PDB file of C-alpha atoms in Angstrom:
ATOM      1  CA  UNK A   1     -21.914  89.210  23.353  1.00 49.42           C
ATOM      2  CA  UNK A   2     -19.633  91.304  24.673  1.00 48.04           C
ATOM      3  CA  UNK A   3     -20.171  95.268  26.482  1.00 50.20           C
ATOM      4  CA  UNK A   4     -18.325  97.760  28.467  1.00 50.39           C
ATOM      5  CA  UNK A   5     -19.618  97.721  32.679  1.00 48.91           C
ATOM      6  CA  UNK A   6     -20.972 100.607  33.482  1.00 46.76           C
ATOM      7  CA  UNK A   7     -21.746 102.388  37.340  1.00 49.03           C
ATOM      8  CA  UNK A   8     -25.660 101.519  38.455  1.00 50.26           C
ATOM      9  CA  UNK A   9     -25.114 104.666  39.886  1.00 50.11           C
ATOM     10  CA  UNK A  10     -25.905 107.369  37.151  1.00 48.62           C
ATOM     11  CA  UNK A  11     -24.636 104.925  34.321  1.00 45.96           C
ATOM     12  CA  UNK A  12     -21.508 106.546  32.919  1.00 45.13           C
ATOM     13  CA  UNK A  13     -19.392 103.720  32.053  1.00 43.72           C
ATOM     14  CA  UNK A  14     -17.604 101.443  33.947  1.00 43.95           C
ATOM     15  CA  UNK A  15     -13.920 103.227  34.607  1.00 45.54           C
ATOM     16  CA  UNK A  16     -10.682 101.135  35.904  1.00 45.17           C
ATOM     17  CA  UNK A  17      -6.686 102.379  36.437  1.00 43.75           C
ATOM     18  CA  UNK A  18      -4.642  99.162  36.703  1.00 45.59           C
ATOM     19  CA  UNK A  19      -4.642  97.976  33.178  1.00 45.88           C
ATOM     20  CA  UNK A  20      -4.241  94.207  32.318  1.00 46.78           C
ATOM     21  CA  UNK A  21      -5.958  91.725  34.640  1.00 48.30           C
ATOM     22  CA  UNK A  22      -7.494  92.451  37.461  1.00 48.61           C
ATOM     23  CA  UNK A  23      -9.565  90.843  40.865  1.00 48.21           C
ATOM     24  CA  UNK A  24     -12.598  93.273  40.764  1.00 46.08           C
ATOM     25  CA  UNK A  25     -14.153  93.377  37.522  1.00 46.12           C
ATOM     26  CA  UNK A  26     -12.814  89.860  36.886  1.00 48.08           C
ATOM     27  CA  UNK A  27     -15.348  89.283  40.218  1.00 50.07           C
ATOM     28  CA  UNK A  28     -18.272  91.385  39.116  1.00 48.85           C
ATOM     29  CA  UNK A  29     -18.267  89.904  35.917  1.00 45.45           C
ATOM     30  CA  UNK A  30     -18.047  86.334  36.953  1.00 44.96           C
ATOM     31  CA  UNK A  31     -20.860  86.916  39.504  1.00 42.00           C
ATOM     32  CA  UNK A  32     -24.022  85.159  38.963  1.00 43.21           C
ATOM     33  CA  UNK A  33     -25.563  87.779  37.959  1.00 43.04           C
ATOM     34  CA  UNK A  34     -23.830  88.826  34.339  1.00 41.56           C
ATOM     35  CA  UNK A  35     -22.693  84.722  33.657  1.00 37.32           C
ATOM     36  CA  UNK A  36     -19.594  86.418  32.131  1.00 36.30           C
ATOM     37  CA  UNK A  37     -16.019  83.998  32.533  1.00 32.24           C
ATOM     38  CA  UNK A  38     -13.331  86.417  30.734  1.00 25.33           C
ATOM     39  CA  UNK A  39     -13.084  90.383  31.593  1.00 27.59           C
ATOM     40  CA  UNK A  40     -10.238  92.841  32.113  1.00 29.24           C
ATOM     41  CA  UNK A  41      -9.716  96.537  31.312  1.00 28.89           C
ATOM     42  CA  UNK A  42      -9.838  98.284  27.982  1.00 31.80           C
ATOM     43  CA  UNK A  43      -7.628 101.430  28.585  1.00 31.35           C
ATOM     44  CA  UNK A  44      -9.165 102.594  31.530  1.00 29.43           C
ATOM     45  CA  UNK A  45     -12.958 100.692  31.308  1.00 27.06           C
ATOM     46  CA  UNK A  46     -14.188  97.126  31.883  1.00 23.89           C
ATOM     47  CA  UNK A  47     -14.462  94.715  28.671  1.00 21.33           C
ATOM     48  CA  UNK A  48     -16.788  91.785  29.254  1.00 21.30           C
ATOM     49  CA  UNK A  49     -17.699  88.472  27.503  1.00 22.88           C
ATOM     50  CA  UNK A  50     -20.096  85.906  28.162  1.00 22.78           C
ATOM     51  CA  UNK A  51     -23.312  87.514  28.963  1.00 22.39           C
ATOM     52  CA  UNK A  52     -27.438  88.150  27.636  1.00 26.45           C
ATOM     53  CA  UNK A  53     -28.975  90.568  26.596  1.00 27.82           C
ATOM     54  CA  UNK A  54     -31.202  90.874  29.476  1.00 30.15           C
ATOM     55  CA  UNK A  55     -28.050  92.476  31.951  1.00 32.82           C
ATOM     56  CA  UNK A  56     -28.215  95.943  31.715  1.00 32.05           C
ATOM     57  CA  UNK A  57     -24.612  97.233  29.817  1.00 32.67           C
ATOM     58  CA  UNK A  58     -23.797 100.043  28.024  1.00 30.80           C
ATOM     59  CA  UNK A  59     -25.251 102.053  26.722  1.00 32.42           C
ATOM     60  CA  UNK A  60     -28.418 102.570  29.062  1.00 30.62           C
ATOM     61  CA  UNK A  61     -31.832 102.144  27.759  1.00 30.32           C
ATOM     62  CA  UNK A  62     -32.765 104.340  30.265  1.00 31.92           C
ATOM     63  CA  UNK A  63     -29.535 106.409  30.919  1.00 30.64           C
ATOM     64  CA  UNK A  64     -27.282 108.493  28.871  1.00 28.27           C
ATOM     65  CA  UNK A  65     -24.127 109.819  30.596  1.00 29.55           C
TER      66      UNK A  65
END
């Protein structure tokens, strides 16, 4: 399944500036906590693959920037 990282903070996407790979949301999305292996950035967000249902990604169940 693949989603778009968004800030825990108030839940508005995810936004990036260096396009093509990158270290941080190649990190994030590796971490144990997603079980995501690719990622990189979509324009200017964070496109992820390789994770459930049950980690919270956009949109917000509960949020709605």
């Amino acid at each position: 399944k693949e989603g778009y990282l968004v800030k825990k903070s108030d839940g508005c996407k995810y936004d990036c500036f260096w396009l093509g790979k990158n270290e941080h949301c190649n990190t994030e999305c590796k971490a144990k906590n997603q079980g995501g292996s690719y990622g990189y950035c979509y324009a200017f967000a964070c496109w992820c693959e390789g994770l459930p249902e049950s980690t919270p990604t956009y949109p917000l169940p509960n949020k709605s920037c």
